[PDB]
mmCIF file of C-alpha atoms and ligand atoms in Angstrom:
data_model
loop_
_atom_site.group_PDB
_atom_site.id
_atom_site.type_symbol
_atom_site.label_atom_id
_atom_site.label_comp_id
_atom_site.label_asym_id
_atom_site.label_seq_id
_atom_site.Cartn_x
_atom_site.Cartn_y
_atom_site.Cartn_z
ATOM 1 C CA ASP R 1 0.000 0.000 0.000
ATOM 2 C CA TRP R 2 2.369 2.721 1.254
ATOM 3 C CA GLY R 3 5.586 3.576 -0.523
ATOM 4 C CA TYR R 4 7.703 6.541 -1.514
ATOM 5 C CA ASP R 5 6.069 7.754 -4.735
ATOM 6 C CA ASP R 6 3.812 10.602 -5.849
ATOM 7 C CA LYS R 7 0.687 8.851 -4.523
ATOM 8 C CA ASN R 8 1.717 6.743 -1.551
ATOM 9 C CA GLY R 9 4.820 8.420 -0.123
ATOM 10 C CA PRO R 10 5.662 10.197 3.190
ATOM 11 C CA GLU R 11 3.221 13.069 2.523
ATOM 12 C CA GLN R 12 0.403 10.458 2.499
ATOM 13 C CA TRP R 13 1.429 8.146 5.338
ATOM 14 C CA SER R 14 -0.605 9.791 8.151
ATOM 15 C CA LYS R 15 -3.870 8.755 6.435
ATOM 16 C CA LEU R 16 -3.434 5.059 7.309
ATOM 17 C CA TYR R 17 -0.677 5.566 9.894
ATOM 18 C CA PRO R 18 -1.703 8.571 12.046
ATOM 19 C CA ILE R 19 1.420 8.192 14.212
ATOM 20 C CA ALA R 20 3.313 9.690 11.242
ATOM 21 C CA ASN R 21 2.394 13.025 12.866
ATOM 22 C CA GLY R 22 3.483 11.866 16.341
ATOM 23 C CA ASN R 23 5.918 13.490 18.764
ATOM 24 C CA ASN R 24 8.750 10.950 18.552
ATOM 25 C CA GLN R 25 9.039 10.439 14.801
ATOM 26 C CA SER R 26 12.212 9.648 12.839
ATOM 27 C CA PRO R 27 14.465 10.576 11.118
ATOM 28 C CA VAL R 28 15.462 14.012 12.454
ATOM 29 C CA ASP R 29 17.944 16.753 11.705
ATOM 30 C CA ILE R 30 20.652 16.764 14.374
ATOM 31 C CA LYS R 31 21.580 20.383 15.140
ATOM 32 C CA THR R 32 24.972 20.090 16.784
ATOM 33 C CA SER R 33 24.651 23.410 18.594
ATOM 34 C CA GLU R 34 21.614 22.046 20.405
ATOM 35 C CA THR R 35 22.795 18.570 21.388
ATOM 36 C CA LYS R 36 23.538 17.855 25.031
ATOM 37 C CA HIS R 37 26.693 16.030 26.037
ATOM 38 C CA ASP R 38 25.791 13.164 28.374
ATOM 39 C CA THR R 39 28.666 12.019 30.577
ATOM 40 C CA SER R 40 26.506 9.119 31.795
ATOM 41 C CA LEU R 41 26.538 7.670 28.266
ATOM 42 C CA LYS R 42 28.824 4.645 27.943
ATOM 43 C CA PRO R 43 30.703 3.678 24.778
ATOM 44 C CA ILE R 44 28.737 1.681 22.224
ATOM 45 C CA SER R 45 29.672 -2.002 22.241
ATOM 46 C CA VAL R 46 28.728 -4.288 19.395
ATOM 47 C CA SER R 47 29.599 -7.959 19.208
ATOM 48 C CA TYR R 48 28.195 -9.766 16.166
ATOM 49 C CA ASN R 49 28.699 -13.402 15.265
ATOM 50 C CA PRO R 50 29.159 -13.796 11.493
ATOM 51 C CA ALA R 51 27.446 -17.178 11.770
ATOM 52 C CA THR R 52 24.164 -15.466 12.651
ATOM 53 C CA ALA R 53 23.923 -14.028 9.086
ATOM 54 C CA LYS R 54 21.034 -15.883 7.451
ATOM 55 C CA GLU R 55 19.555 -14.429 4.270
ATOM 56 C CA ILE R 56 19.107 -11.488 1.948
ATOM 57 C CA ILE R 57 15.626 -10.580 0.742
ATOM 58 C CA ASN R 58 13.946 -7.981 -1.505
ATOM 59 C CA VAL R 59 11.081 -6.448 0.438
ATOM 60 C CA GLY R 60 9.783 -4.242 -2.334
ATOM 61 C CA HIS R 61 10.742 -0.803 -1.023
ATOM 62 C CA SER R 62 14.181 -2.032 0.043
ATOM 63 C CA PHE R 63 16.270 -5.115 0.669
ATOM 64 C CA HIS R 64 17.129 -6.598 4.059
ATOM 65 C CA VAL R 65 19.879 -8.816 5.353
ATOM 66 C CA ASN R 66 18.340 -10.960 8.102
ATOM 67 C CA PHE R 67 20.110 -12.603 11.023
ATOM 68 C CA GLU R 68 19.201 -15.712 13.075
ATOM 69 C CA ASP R 69 17.220 -14.711 16.167
ATOM 70 C CA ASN R 70 17.666 -17.803 18.349
ATOM 71 C CA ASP R 71 20.113 -16.466 20.914
ATOM 72 C CA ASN R 72 22.229 -13.523 22.005
ATOM 73 C CA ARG R 73 25.251 -14.447 19.864
ATOM 74 C CA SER R 74 25.069 -11.036 18.127
ATOM 75 C CA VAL R 75 24.336 -8.139 20.454
ATOM 76 C CA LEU R 76 24.511 -4.385 20.991
ATOM 77 C CA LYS R 77 25.070 -2.959 24.478
ATOM 78 C CA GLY R 78 26.428 0.103 26.256
ATOM 79 C CA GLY R 79 25.547 3.589 25.072
ATOM 80 C CA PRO R 80 22.253 4.632 26.672
ATOM 81 C CA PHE R 81 21.212 1.043 27.230
ATOM 82 C CA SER R 82 20.711 -1.034 30.376
ATOM 83 C CA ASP R 83 19.656 -4.043 28.348
ATOM 84 C CA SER R 84 21.420 -5.955 25.603
ATOM 85 C CA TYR R 85 19.650 -5.737 22.263
ATOM 86 C CA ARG R 86 19.804 -8.616 19.774
ATOM 87 C CA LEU R 87 20.727 -7.937 16.129
ATOM 88 C CA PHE R 88 18.047 -9.047 13.657
ATOM 89 C CA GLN R 89 18.724 -7.241 10.368
ATOM 90 C CA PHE R 90 20.503 -4.481 8.521
ATOM 91 C CA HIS R 91 19.472 -2.502 5.481
ATOM 92 C CA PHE R 92 20.056 0.722 3.556
ATOM 93 C CA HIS R 93 18.186 3.828 2.515
ATOM 94 C CA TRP R 94 19.138 5.791 -0.594
ATOM 95 C CA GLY R 95 17.859 8.490 -2.937
ATOM 96 C CA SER R 96 16.975 9.125 -6.532
ATOM 97 C CA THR R 97 20.305 10.896 -6.961
ATOM 98 C CA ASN R 98 23.717 10.020 -5.567
ATOM 99 C CA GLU R 99 23.904 13.240 -3.628
ATOM 100 C CA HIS R 100 20.569 13.176 -1.772
ATOM 101 C CA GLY R 101 19.415 9.980 -0.118
ATOM 102 C CA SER R 102 20.066 9.667 3.616
ATOM 103 C CA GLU R 103 17.374 9.835 6.273
ATOM 104 C CA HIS R 104 19.042 11.555 9.175
ATOM 105 C CA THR R 105 20.730 14.880 8.515
ATOM 106 C CA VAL R 106 23.355 16.709 10.569
ATOM 107 C CA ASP R 107 23.235 20.499 10.808
ATOM 108 C CA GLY R 108 20.863 20.547 7.842
ATOM 109 C CA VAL R 109 23.163 18.438 5.619
ATOM 110 C CA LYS R 110 21.621 15.551 3.669
ATOM 111 C CA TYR R 111 23.974 12.671 2.869
ATOM 112 C CA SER R 112 23.912 10.200 -0.064
ATOM 113 C CA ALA R 113 22.533 7.165 1.735
ATOM 114 C CA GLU R 114 22.249 5.580 5.160
ATOM 115 C CA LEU R 115 23.020 2.256 6.815
ATOM 116 C CA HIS R 116 20.609 0.958 9.481
ATOM 117 C CA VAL R 117 21.526 -1.926 11.845
ATOM 118 C CA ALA R 118 18.431 -2.977 13.747
ATOM 119 C CA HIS R 119 18.237 -4.738 17.120
ATOM 120 C CA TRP R 120 15.453 -5.712 19.564
ATOM 121 C CA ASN R 121 15.291 -5.819 23.339
ATOM 122 C CA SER R 122 15.516 -9.542 24.024
ATOM 123 C CA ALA R 123 16.462 -8.951 27.637
ATOM 124 C CA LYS R 124 12.955 -7.670 28.402
ATOM 125 C CA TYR R 125 10.644 -9.031 25.697
ATOM 126 C CA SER R 126 9.571 -12.403 24.416
ATOM 127 C CA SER R 127 10.086 -11.790 20.709
ATOM 128 C CA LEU R 128 10.752 -9.138 18.059
ATOM 129 C CA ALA R 129 6.988 -9.040 17.662
ATOM 130 C CA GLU R 130 6.420 -8.187 21.338
ATOM 131 C CA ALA R 131 9.198 -5.594 21.340
ATOM 132 C CA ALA R 132 8.189 -4.036 18.010
ATOM 133 C CA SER R 133 5.827 -1.461 19.460
ATOM 134 C CA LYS R 134 7.353 -0.847 22.892
ATOM 135 C CA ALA R 135 9.116 2.473 23.573
ATOM 136 C CA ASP R 136 12.212 0.556 24.633
ATOM 137 C CA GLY R 137 11.733 -2.326 22.209
ATOM 138 C CA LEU R 138 14.147 -1.564 19.371
ATOM 139 C CA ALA R 139 17.661 -0.182 18.881
ATOM 140 C CA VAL R 140 18.929 0.986 15.499
ATOM 141 C CA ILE R 141 22.412 2.204 14.599
ATOM 142 C CA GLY R 142 22.342 4.693 11.755
ATOM 143 C CA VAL R 143 25.455 5.399 9.724
ATOM 144 C CA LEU R 144 25.441 8.266 7.219
ATOM 145 C CA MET R 145 26.935 7.321 3.856
ATOM 146 C CA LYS R 146 28.645 9.818 1.574
ATOM 147 C CA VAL R 147 29.218 9.221 -2.127
ATOM 148 C CA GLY R 148 32.902 9.085 -3.064
ATOM 149 C CA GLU R 149 35.342 6.136 -2.995
ATOM 150 C CA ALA R 150 33.947 2.613 -3.361
ATOM 151 C CA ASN R 151 33.443 0.906 -0.019
ATOM 152 C CA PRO R 152 35.068 -2.551 -0.153
ATOM 153 C CA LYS R 153 33.080 -3.753 2.875
ATOM 154 C CA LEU R 154 29.801 -3.543 0.896
ATOM 155 C CA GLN R 155 30.965 -6.044 -1.716
ATOM 156 C CA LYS R 156 29.405 -9.225 -0.335
ATOM 157 C CA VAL R 157 26.063 -7.433 -0.095
ATOM 158 C CA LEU R 158 26.334 -6.030 -3.607
ATOM 159 C CA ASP R 159 27.219 -9.369 -5.216
ATOM 160 C CA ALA R 160 24.112 -10.884 -3.667
ATOM 161 C CA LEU R 161 21.773 -8.317 -5.223
ATOM 162 C CA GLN R 162 21.484 -10.035 -8.600
ATOM 163 C CA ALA R 163 19.926 -12.974 -6.741
ATOM 164 C CA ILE R 164 17.049 -10.885 -5.328
ATOM 165 C CA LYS R 165 15.998 -8.752 -8.269
ATOM 166 C CA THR R 166 12.223 -8.528 -7.617
ATOM 167 C CA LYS R 167 9.923 -8.273 -4.578
ATOM 168 C CA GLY R 168 9.921 -11.394 -2.422
ATOM 169 C CA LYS R 169 13.069 -12.919 -3.897
ATOM 170 C CA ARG R 170 15.342 -14.324 -1.205
ATOM 171 C CA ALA R 171 18.833 -15.809 -1.227
ATOM 172 C CA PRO R 172 21.057 -17.324 1.475
ATOM 173 C CA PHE R 173 23.481 -14.859 2.998
ATOM 174 C CA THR R 174 25.935 -16.257 5.472
ATOM 175 C CA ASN R 175 29.118 -15.582 7.340
ATOM 176 C CA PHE R 176 29.054 -11.799 7.567
ATOM 177 C CA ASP R 177 29.735 -9.437 10.434
ATOM 178 C CA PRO R 178 28.030 -6.096 9.753
ATOM 179 C CA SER R 179 30.146 -4.390 12.438
ATOM 180 C CA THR R 180 32.755 -4.237 9.662
ATOM 181 C CA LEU R 181 30.519 -1.611 7.997
ATOM 182 C CA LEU R 182 30.742 0.710 10.998
ATOM 183 C CA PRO R 183 33.121 3.724 11.028
ATOM 184 C CA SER R 184 36.319 3.685 13.077
ATOM 185 C CA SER R 185 35.133 6.312 15.557
ATOM 186 C CA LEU R 186 32.164 5.210 17.605
ATOM 187 C CA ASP R 187 31.343 8.693 18.811
ATOM 188 C CA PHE R 188 27.585 8.956 18.466
ATOM 189 C CA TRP R 189 24.378 10.821 19.024
ATOM 190 C CA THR R 190 21.302 9.204 20.585
ATOM 191 C CA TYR R 191 17.638 10.241 20.764
ATOM 192 C CA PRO R 192 14.205 8.573 21.235
ATOM 193 C CA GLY R 193 12.395 7.936 17.950
ATOM 194 C CA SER R 194 10.572 5.689 15.516
ATOM 195 C CA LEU R 195 10.699 3.381 12.544
ATOM 196 C CA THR R 196 11.302 5.658 9.568
ATOM 197 C CA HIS R 197 8.541 4.049 7.491
ATOM 198 C CA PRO R 198 5.160 2.402 8.242
ATOM 199 C CA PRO R 199 4.070 1.155 10.669
ATOM 200 C CA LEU R 200 6.171 4.031 12.155
ATOM 201 C CA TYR R 201 6.035 2.755 15.766
ATOM 202 C CA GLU R 202 7.723 5.106 18.254
ATOM 203 C CA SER R 203 9.696 2.123 19.503
ATOM 204 C CA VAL R 204 13.239 3.011 18.538
ATOM 205 C CA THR R 205 16.255 4.251 20.475
ATOM 206 C CA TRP R 206 18.456 5.726 17.750
ATOM 207 C CA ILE R 207 22.246 5.633 17.768
ATOM 208 C CA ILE R 208 23.640 7.853 14.990
ATOM 209 C CA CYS R 209 27.383 7.689 14.292
ATOM 210 C CA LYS R 210 29.417 10.917 14.060
ATOM 211 C CA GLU R 211 31.565 9.652 11.199
ATOM 212 C CA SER R 212 30.250 8.799 7.752
ATOM 213 C CA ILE R 213 31.353 5.842 5.648
ATOM 214 C CA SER R 214 31.917 5.908 1.877
ATOM 215 C CA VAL R 215 29.971 4.462 -1.050
ATOM 216 C CA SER R 216 30.628 4.922 -4.750
ATOM 217 C CA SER R 217 28.212 6.102 -7.417
ATOM 218 C CA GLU R 218 28.477 2.703 -9.078
ATOM 219 C CA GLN R 219 27.622 0.944 -5.827
ATOM 220 C CA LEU R 220 24.553 3.141 -5.239
ATOM 221 C CA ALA R 221 23.513 2.323 -8.787
ATOM 222 C CA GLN R 222 23.408 -1.335 -7.748
ATOM 223 C CA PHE R 223 20.869 -0.503 -4.988
ATOM 224 C CA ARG R 224 18.692 1.352 -7.530
ATOM 225 C CA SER R 225 18.860 -1.487 -10.036
ATOM 226 C CA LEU R 226 16.682 -3.639 -7.762
ATOM 227 C CA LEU R 227 13.013 -3.804 -8.736
ATOM 228 C CA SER R 228 10.078 -2.999 -6.473
ATOM 229 C CA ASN R 229 7.657 -5.056 -8.563
ATOM 230 C CA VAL R 230 6.930 -8.760 -8.402
ATOM 231 C CA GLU R 231 8.530 -10.872 -11.150
ATOM 232 C CA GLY R 232 6.404 -10.898 -14.277
ATOM 233 C CA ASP R 233 4.924 -7.461 -13.709
ATOM 234 C CA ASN R 234 6.214 -4.310 -15.311
ATOM 235 C CA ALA R 235 9.576 -3.259 -13.962
ATOM 236 C CA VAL R 236 9.596 -0.509 -11.388
ATOM 237 C CA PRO R 237 13.094 0.415 -10.224
ATOM 238 C CA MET R 238 13.722 0.769 -6.496
ATOM 239 C CA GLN R 239 14.842 4.373 -7.086
ATOM 240 C CA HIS R 240 14.527 5.889 -3.598
ATOM 241 C CA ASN R 241 13.318 5.110 -0.077
ATOM 242 C CA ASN R 242 14.265 7.887 2.346
ATOM 243 C CA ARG R 243 11.819 9.731 4.617
ATOM 244 C CA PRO R 244 12.023 13.508 5.193
ATOM 245 C CA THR R 245 13.176 14.581 8.675
ATOM 246 C CA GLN R 246 10.522 15.169 11.339
ATOM 247 C CA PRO R 247 10.158 17.784 14.074
ATOM 248 C CA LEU R 248 11.868 16.982 17.365
ATOM 249 C CA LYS R 249 8.785 18.148 19.272
ATOM 250 C CA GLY R 250 10.738 18.791 22.472
ATOM 251 C CA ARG R 251 13.094 15.826 22.307
ATOM 252 C CA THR R 252 16.740 16.200 23.234
ATOM 253 C CA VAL R 253 19.509 14.714 21.132
ATOM 254 C CA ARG R 254 22.318 13.481 23.369
ATOM 255 C CA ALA R 255 25.949 13.421 22.234
ATOM 256 C CA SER R 256 28.599 11.007 23.503
ATOM 257 C CA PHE R 257 31.274 13.563 22.740
HETATM 258 C C1 LIG K 1 4.645 -5.055 5.166
HETATM 259 C C2 LIG K 1 4.953 -6.486 5.580
HETATM 260 C C3 LIG K 1 3.729 -7.169 6.159
HETATM 261 O O1 LIG K 1 6.037 -6.525 6.507
HETATM 262 C C4 LIG K 1 7.208 -7.181 5.958
HETATM 263 C C5 LIG K 1 8.483 -7.179 6.755
HETATM 264 C C6 LIG K 1 8.387 -7.123 8.143
HETATM 265 C C7 LIG K 1 9.535 -7.096 8.937
HETATM 266 C C8 LIG K 1 10.794 -7.114 8.357
HETATM 267 S S1 LIG K 1 12.132 -7.064 9.256
HETATM 268 N N1 LIG K 1 13.355 -7.758 8.450
HETATM 269 O O2 LIG K 1 11.913 -7.701 10.514
HETATM 270 O O3 LIG K 1 12.494 -5.695 9.464
HETATM 271 C C9 LIG K 1 10.885 -7.145 6.970
HETATM 272 C C10 LIG K 1 9.740 -7.180 6.171
HETATM 273 C C11 LIG K 1 6.917 -7.663 4.743
HETATM 274 C C12 LIG K 1 7.769 -8.473 3.793
HETATM 275 C C13 LIG K 1 8.595 -9.504 4.229
HETATM 276 C C14 LIG K 1 9.359 -10.240 3.323
HETATM 277 C C15 LIG K 1 9.303 -9.943 1.967
HETATM 278 C C16 LIG K 1 8.474 -8.920 1.535
HETATM 279 F F1 LIG K 1 8.411 -8.619 0.230
HETATM 280 C C17 LIG K 1 7.720 -8.182 2.442
HETATM 281 C C18 LIG K 1 5.544 -7.253 4.430
HETATM 282 O O4 LIG K 1 4.942 -7.487 3.388
HETATM 283 C C1 LIG K 2 6.151 -10.414 11.963
HETATM 284 C C2 LIG K 2 6.624 -9.009 12.330
HETATM 285 C C3 LIG K 2 8.140 -8.915 12.318
HETATM 286 O O1 LIG K 2 6.098 -8.586 13.582
HETATM 287 C C4 LIG K 2 5.171 -7.459 13.429
HETATM 288 C C5 LIG K 2 4.452 -6.977 14.659
HETATM 289 C C6 LIG K 2 4.040 -7.958 15.560
HETATM 290 C C7 LIG K 2 3.390 -7.610 16.737
HETATM 291 C C8 LIG K 2 3.149 -6.268 17.031
HETATM 292 S S1 LIG K 2 2.403 -5.906 18.410
HETATM 293 N N1 LIG K 2 3.467 -5.188 19.383
HETATM 294 O O2 LIG K 2 1.995 -7.141 19.020
HETATM 295 O O3 LIG K 2 1.235 -5.066 18.240
HETATM 296 C C9 LIG K 2 3.574 -5.283 16.136
HETATM 297 C C10 LIG K 2 4.228 -5.634 14.953
HETATM 298 C C11 LIG K 2 5.129 -7.066 12.150
HETATM 299 C C12 LIG K 2 4.383 -5.949 11.440
HETATM 300 C C13 LIG K 2 4.944 -5.379 10.287
HETATM 301 C C14 LIG K 2 4.320 -4.363 9.561
HETATM 302 C C15 LIG K 2 3.083 -3.897 9.982
HETATM 303 C C16 LIG K 2 2.506 -4.457 11.127
HETATM 304 F F1 LIG K 2 1.306 -4.002 11.532
HETATM 305 C C17 LIG K 2 3.139 -5.479 11.850
HETATM 306 C C18 LIG K 2 5.978 -8.004 11.418
HETATM 307 O O4 LIG K 2 6.129 -8.010 10.210
HETATM 308 C C1 LIG K 3 8.540 -3.694 13.804
HETATM 309 C C2 LIG K 3 9.506 -4.372 12.836
HETATM 310 C C3 LIG K 3 10.033 -5.706 13.336
HETATM 311 O O1 LIG K 3 10.582 -3.492 12.534
HETATM 312 C C4 LIG K 3 10.558 -3.042 11.158
HETATM 313 C C5 LIG K 3 11.471 -1.890 10.835
HETATM 314 C C6 LIG K 3 12.707 -1.826 11.488
HETATM 315 C C7 LIG K 3 13.570 -0.749 11.294
HETATM 316 C C8 LIG K 3 13.196 0.278 10.430
HETATM 317 S S1 LIG K 3 14.165 1.543 10.225
HETATM 318 N N1 LIG K 3 14.155 2.129 8.731
HETATM 319 O O2 LIG K 3 15.515 1.227 10.625
HETATM 320 O O3 LIG K 3 13.628 2.526 11.089
HETATM 321 C C9 LIG K 3 11.949 0.230 9.811
HETATM 322 C C10 LIG K 3 11.082 -0.846 10.012
HETATM 323 C C11 LIG K 3 9.577 -3.678 10.512
HETATM 324 C C12 LIG K 3 9.135 -3.605 9.087
HETATM 325 C C13 LIG K 3 7.807 -3.332 8.807
HETATM 326 C C14 LIG K 3 7.360 -3.264 7.493
HETATM 327 C C15 LIG K 3 8.245 -3.476 6.449
HETATM 328 C C16 LIG K 3 9.577 -3.754 6.751
HETATM 329 F F1 LIG K 3 10.458 -3.958 5.775
HETATM 330 C C17 LIG K 3 10.024 -3.818 8.056
HETATM 331 C C18 LIG K 3 8.901 -4.533 11.475
HETATM 332 O O4 LIG K 3 7.997 -5.307 11.219
HETATM 333 ZN ZN1 LIG K 4 15.897 1.969 7.868
#
């Protein structure tokens, strides 16, 4: 139903998903003059087991790399968290052009694309499903991506894309540690927010990295070469899937630095 186009995109979401106009919506513009340093913030600690990598799948508006959810082999802790959060997938957002495709912005600056590494609170909840709509249910690391030099760490992901050309296509995807996609500095901002597309639950603690990572124009072109349609239908390229930033509505963005 929803999407990113002229008829079903972000401007239209609040019709079926009224929380689109909520007070903890994501993404946001991080104004660095207005962030608050939090000395009680601990360093971010991620520990992912490459063996938890399971599959890669075209979900129509995007593609996802899913991880096995059985145990806490791959976890995120530290930062603002009391609980350990279990990794369950990562994915990207990008734009119609190579220069304008991220979701979060920093001091009004839009980046080329964005990496999201999603986790759920398995310490407190029974399942991803139970956590999905709890204020403290999900944790997502966002990394801003800036077009420039090719990023060698993306290669395994990119090579898999030809195996998931149309909506619903899935392929095995194993032995990969997405922490290798993270920048060297783990300075970060954090703020309370939401999924950046429907159902838009305000269930997400966001961790946004201070440093960007690279991506080349040719690599972004591989993202856009995916199709949003089901095989057999007319081809619709997966051209863009980033949401505009949303008002902070009183929220405070905390900085670890
Ligand atoms: C909108 C609705 C019902 O939700 C999902 C979906 C939910 C959660 C996650 S995830 N990986 O947990 O974030 C990913 C996808 C799909 C979906 C799943 C596989 C292939 C596909 F083409 C679509 C849907 O059709
Ligand atoms: C299977 C999986 C991952 O789980 C949930 C989900 C489960 C339970 C609850 S809750 N907290 O019980 O209301 C909330 C969400 C969805 C889901 C995805 C898109 C739209 C939607 F409405 C639900 C999924 O695709
Ligand atoms: C609640 C639960 C498990 O989480 C997500 C989800 C996670 C992270 C982000 S994001 N872009 O990082 O904020 C956005 C959405 C979905 C989901 C729903 C519909 C389609 C889909 F592909 C995924 C879910 O069903
Ligand atoms: Zn995302």
